[PDB]
Amino acid sequence: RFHSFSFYELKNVTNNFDERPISVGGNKMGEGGFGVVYKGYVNNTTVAVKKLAATTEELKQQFDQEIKVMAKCQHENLVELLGFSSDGDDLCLVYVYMPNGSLLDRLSCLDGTPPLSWHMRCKIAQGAANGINFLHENHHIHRDIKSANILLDEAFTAKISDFGLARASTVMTSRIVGTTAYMAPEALRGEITPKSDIYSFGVVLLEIITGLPAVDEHREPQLLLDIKEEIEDEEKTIEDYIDKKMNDADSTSVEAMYSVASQCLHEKKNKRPDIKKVQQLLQEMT
Ligand SMILES: CC(C)Nc1cc(-n2ncc3cc(C#N)cnc32)ncc1C(=O)NC[C@@H](F)C(C)(C)O
């Protein structure tokens, strides 16, 4: 299904895993908790090489998990796996490179990219939803839905990535994983449910409206989730939080997206809409 690489081929393609940023002529594109992503070229093909970095048996399990899911799931709103490398202690995953990186980076204008327009942010949300929907229809729960995991191609097509924590099929776990700033309350407890993915997507929709990261240690309030409490308790409005880095954001569509986000952000798992409803609401928005 996927091409098996030898770890040395990948050392060659990535200029021996150069840690300098791609903007400066290096190879580093970014990093998560489970690894660092590098740029490369395999047979004229631009690739993204995720070098897994830490426990070892859990990492191998997350590596095998990404491969199993990717083998089954192929969609226009999902990232594409070309191959991998499991030669010794180093575990690598090779993907089709995303010319526009992550939604997180584009929302912050990392490396001087222009701010995304409202129209583009809407199309991106619509893409992301179709991706979550395909995974859900295929009985998969992502477990790590966040803007760092919503990637963008040359046309700004949303592509869901990082399936190392993905699960099949409400169950429980002894190892709590994900990014706390996006995690549904039950997920923080240890519950595994597709409804948690809906909550995480609502945090993403708030990032899309505001241009603010879900968590910022140097910000009051540190958590973007707290901003919804301020709006709900009539102390502020969504208008006070609309990203100032855009000019084409009209209040009707902005409030319409906030409505979807607040429905997604229901405290109670069963009160949240399902993905097909989220898609319907987002399509209605435009
Ligand atoms: C690590 C992250 C944040 N950035 C990327 C990630 C990726 N890809 N592409 C596929 C892919 C899959 C995973 C996973 N799981 C992780 N990363 C992946 N491709 C590309 C970029 C990437 O930065 N392109 C560069 C782009 F942003 C530019 C030119 C404006 O500077």
Q: Which domains does the chain have, with CATH numbers?
A: 2-97 (3.30.200.20), 98-286 (1.10.510.10)
How far is Cα 261 from Cα 227, in angstroms, rounded to an integer?
12
- State the SS3 of 1-47: CCEECCHHHHHHHCCCCCCCEHHHCCCEEEECCCEEEEEEEECCEEE
Ligand 1 atom having least distance to the Cα of 66: 15
Q: Which of 34, 147, 151, 161 for a ligand 1 pocket mutation test, highest count of atoms within 8 Å of Cβ?
A: 151
**Residues with catalytic function:** 144
Q: Collapsing DSSP states into helix, strand and coil, what is residue 217?
A: coil
How far is Cα 4 from Cα 67, in angstroms, rounded to an integer?
11
How far is Cα 50 from Cα 62, in angstroms, rounded to an integer?
12
Resolution (A): 2.8
Q: In the beta sheet, which residues pair with residue 210?
A: none
Ligand 1 atom having least distance to the Cα of 22: 31
What is the 48 CA–ligand 1 centroid distance (Å)? 6
**H or E stretch at 191:** strand 191-192
What is the 211 CA–ligand 1 centroid distance (Å)? 19
By C-alpha distance, which of 191, 208, 200, 209 is closest to 266?
200
Residue 162 Cβ contacting ligand 1 at under 6 Å: yes
Q: In what order do the strands lie in the sheet with 45-52?
A: 3-4, 81-85, 92-96, 45-52, 35-42, 28-31
DSSP class of 182: T
How far is Cα 67 from Cα 70, in angstroms, rounded to an integer?
5
**Closest Cα to atom 15 of ligand 1:** 162
Residue 102 Cβ contacting ligand 1 at under 6 Å: yes
Pairing of strands 92-96, 45-52: antiparallel
